[PDB]
Ligand binder design. Structure first.
Ligand SMILES: *[C@@H]1O[C@H](CO)[C@@H](O[C@@H]2O[C@H](CO)[C@@H](O)[C@H](O)[C@H]2NC(C)=O)[C@H](O)[C@H]1NC(C)=O
Ligand SMILES: *[C@@H]1O[C@H](CO)[C@@H](O[C@@H]2O[C@H](CO)[C@@H](O)[C@H](O)[C@H]2NC(C)=O)[C@H](O)[C@H]1NC(C)=O
Ligand SMILES: *[C@@H]1O[C@H](CO)[C@@H](O[C@@H]2O[C@H](CO)[C@@H](O)[C@H](O)[C@H]2NC(C)=O)[C@H](O)[C@H]1NC(C)=O
Ligand SMILES: *[C@@H]1O[C@H](CO)[C@@H](O[C@@H]2O[C@H](CO)[C@@H](O)[C@H](O)[C@H]2NC(C)=O)[C@H](O)[C@H]1NC(C)=O
Ligand SMILES: *[C@@H]1O[C@H](CO)[C@@H](O[C@@H]2O[C@H](CO)[C@@H](O)[C@H](O)[C@H]2NC(C)=O)[C@H](O)[C@H]1NC(C)=O
Ligand SMILES: *[C@@H]1O[C@H](CO)[C@@H](O[C@@H]2O[C@H](CO)[C@@H](O)[C@H](O)[C@H]2NC(C)=O)[C@H](O)[C@H]1NC(C)=O
Ligand SMILES: *[C@@H]1O[C@H](CO)[C@@H](O)[C@H](O)[C@H]1NC(C)=O
Lengths: 169, 50, 86, 193, 50
């Protein structure tokens, strides 16, 4: 309002406390932006890692798993996403960096590839990936032999459909 | 010359046009100037605050 | 100590990572340890490799009953102001 | 013998009413902050010009208070709608939505009243003390593939059993807990038993 | 004479700053609901089968 001039600054005192309210409001909305991120991404206790030898029954997760030779250890599809999108004014940095959030999503993704839904209810219990896929088929009302007799076709369809997200983005 | 402000002046890598006397950016703040004796253009940076 | 949030004076920069206590920003937190004030990069949690293979399964042999609380605001104070008398 | 999410509402509302009260002592560019000291030592033509600045400042104070109450009541309404939905889905039923009624497999919930809110006590089941086993998708017997009806085939190292998936309780593999579909030459990982 | 002219600027700039701060409250209340939906989808679609 004044820009470092004592004449304007003394007249401003006559307006009371409007400018302590404005700062209180902006601080209250800058704290909840970090609260917003904490409740979407910190949904794990452990940071789970995936095994070095990756045989998941024909399913291929290589375009969504972290890539060490990339910036911030992001996945291949997390990169396409980060490439597509003075006077009393300042911008505060977020509490979680982008590296930390990519770490959180890789822990969620290694928990689900490897334990199914067990890690969101307690300790993670490993199960082979095709048997997890058979449980999920049971959950929609198809029998398990329909997965086990069509494993290679279901895995090819999944791989070919993950390959199209990458093109469309 | 009448351009009045406060800040820290450094030397720059801009190139005005011979008739142009000072520069300004988006939001229309002055961020460069030409001084009327050396004929050199200088960057203007606000003095640190926080 | 120079962070990305600014310049920090009066806190020692340790090398270990704890849970966040007071958020400084851009990944740095501070805490009162031992007796002094220290500043560190926060830790996300303990690491864990799952013993995944293609014919191994883990099955639980016991259970616990857990009870936890959840608190929610329903209402606030009803106030009126007479605009003329104010 | 915790409740900060309820104390935050009380504190924010008191902190707004205090600011509204305290703005009654600014001049807003008049000679006095009290209206009677403008009325007592001034006559109507010049009392009016000073009274108008007080009216202008106090009106703006009041409008800021009311707008920020309207924005905060809309946040309280979302919370109360969520608490109504939890009362219906966690206390009057058993939910399958993960994490909706506590961490773990929801069993039941009990409500308790609080000063301007509600506390839900969530009872959940948490599995414990897991052991390692060897698995197979199907069994092969007589040139037929056998699948479990509800469970998994597990091996303790030498013997094969069926168990339910959340509690270890091994049983013999019979024609009453399995079903048949096909040959044992199409599924990847059949074992012979 | 400069008091009367400075007050006209003070009033305008205060109005503009307070309009900025109201519209940010209204925009943050909308980002908050989106993040609340994202937190529910992470629980119900990523750590479960819906
Ligand atoms: C999973 O799919 C990826 C494709 O995205 C495979 O990796 C690429 O395969 C092509 C074809 O041989 C090579 O030219 C590339 O060099 C591979 N690496 C890339 C693109 O980073 C990968 O081999 C597949 N995984 C398995 C186990 O087959
Ligand atoms: C303004 O006048 C000064 C001299 O009063 C000029 O300064 C000279 O500038 C040249 C560069 O072109 C130097 O080589 C000389 O050494 C300078 N002399 C002195 C005494 O400073 C300056 O060039 C003039 N500028 C204009 C625009 O008229
Ligand atoms: C199931 O077996 C695996 C593999 O044998 C066990 O994984 C071990 O994990 C520890 C981590 O503290 C490693 O140091 C070992 O090298 C792993 N292999 C071993 C001990 O053979 C896993 O702990 C077993 N699970 C249970 C519930 O006993
Ligand atoms: C796997 O389980 C089987 C059956 O529970 C075990 O076989 C029995 O072991 C008991 C040990 O006291 C013997 O008395 C029985 O005669 C065995 N055969 C049966 C019940 O048919 C087997 O020992 C277990 N294997 C391992 C490695 O623990
Ligand atoms: C599961 O993985 C194991 C080990 O990675 C596989 O065992 C390998 O099987 C191939 C062919 O069946 C052999 O050539 C390898 O020598 C085996 N590895 C070892 C260490 O013995 C197994 O085939 C995989 N598939 C299952 C169990 O269905
Ligand atoms: C499981 O048992 C079957 C027999 O019931 C085995 O099948 C034989 O496999 C060999 C080698 O592949 C063939 O030469 C025979 O003709 C098969 N006989 C029959 C009746 O199918 C099978 O190899 C066994 N597999 C394991 C892992 O034990
Ligand atoms: C912290 O660890 C790094 C290791 O790269 C080391 O260079 C640095 O001196 C350490 N600082 C302290 C205070 O121990």
């Amino acid at each position: 309002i004044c820009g470092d001039s004592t004449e304007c600054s003394n007249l401003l005192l006559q307006y009371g406390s409007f400018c302590t309210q404005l700062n209180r409001a902006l601080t209250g909305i800058a704290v909840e932006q970090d609260k917003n991120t904490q409740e979407v991404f910190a949904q794990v206790k452990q940071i789970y890692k995936t095994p070095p030898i990756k045989d998941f029954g024909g399913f291929n997760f290589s375009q969504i798993l972290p890539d060490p030779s990339k910036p911030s250890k992001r996945s291949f599809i997390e990169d396409l996403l980060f490439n597509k999108v003075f006077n009393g004014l300042t911008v505060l940095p977020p509490l979680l960096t982008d590296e930390m959030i990519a770490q959180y999503t890789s822990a969620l993704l290694a928990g689900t590839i490897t334990s199914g839904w067990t890690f969101g209810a307690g300790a993670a219990l490993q199960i082979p990936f095709a048997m997890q896929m058979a449980y999920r088929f049971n959950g929609i009302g198809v029998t398990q032999n329909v997965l086990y007799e069509n494993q290679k076709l279901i895995a090819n369809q999944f791989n070919s459909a993950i390959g199209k997200i990458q093109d469309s983005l | 010359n009448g351009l009045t402000g406060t800040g820290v002046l450094t030397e720059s890598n801009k190139k005005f046009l011979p008739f142009q006397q000072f520069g300004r950016d988006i939001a229309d703040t002055t961020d460069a100037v030409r001084d009327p004796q050396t004929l050199e253009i200088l960057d203007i940076t606000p003095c640190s605050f926080g | 100590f120079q962070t990305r949030a600014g310049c920090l004076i009066g806190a020692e920069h340790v090398n270990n990572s704890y849970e966040c206590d007071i958020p400084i920003g851009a990944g740095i937190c501070a805490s009162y340890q031992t007796q002094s004030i220290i500043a560190y990069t926060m830790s996300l949690g303990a690491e864990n490799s799952v013993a995944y293979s293609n014919n191994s399964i883990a099955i639980p042999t016991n259970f616990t009953i857990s009870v936890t609380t959840e608190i929610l605001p329903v209402s606030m104070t009803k106030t009126s102001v007479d605009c003329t008398m104010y | 013998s915790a409740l900060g999410k309820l104390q935050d509402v009380v504190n924010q509302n008191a902190q707004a009413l205090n600011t509204l009260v305290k703005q009654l002592s600014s001049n807003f560019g008049a000679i006095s902050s009290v209206l009677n000291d403008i009325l007592s030592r001034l006559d109507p033509p010049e009392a009016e010009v000073q009274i108008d600045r007080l009216i202008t400042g106090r009106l703006q104070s009041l409008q800021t208070y009311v707008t920020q109450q309207l924005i905060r009541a809309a946040e309280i309404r979302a919370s109360a709608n969520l608490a109504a939905t939890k009362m219906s889905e966690c206390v009057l039923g058993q939910s399958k939505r993960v994490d909706f009624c506590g961490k773990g497999y929801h069993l039941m919930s009990f409500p308790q009243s609080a000063p301007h809110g509600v506390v839900f006590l969530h009872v959940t089941y948490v599995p414990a003390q897991e052991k390692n086993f060897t698995t197979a998708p199907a069994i092969c017997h007589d040139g037929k593939a056998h699948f479990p009806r509800e469970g998994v085939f597990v091996s303790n190292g030498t013997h094969w059993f069926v168990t339910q998936r959340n509690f270890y309780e091994p049983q013999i593999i019979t024609t009453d807990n399995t079903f048949v579909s096909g040959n044992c030459d199409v599924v990847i990982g059949i074992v012979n038993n």
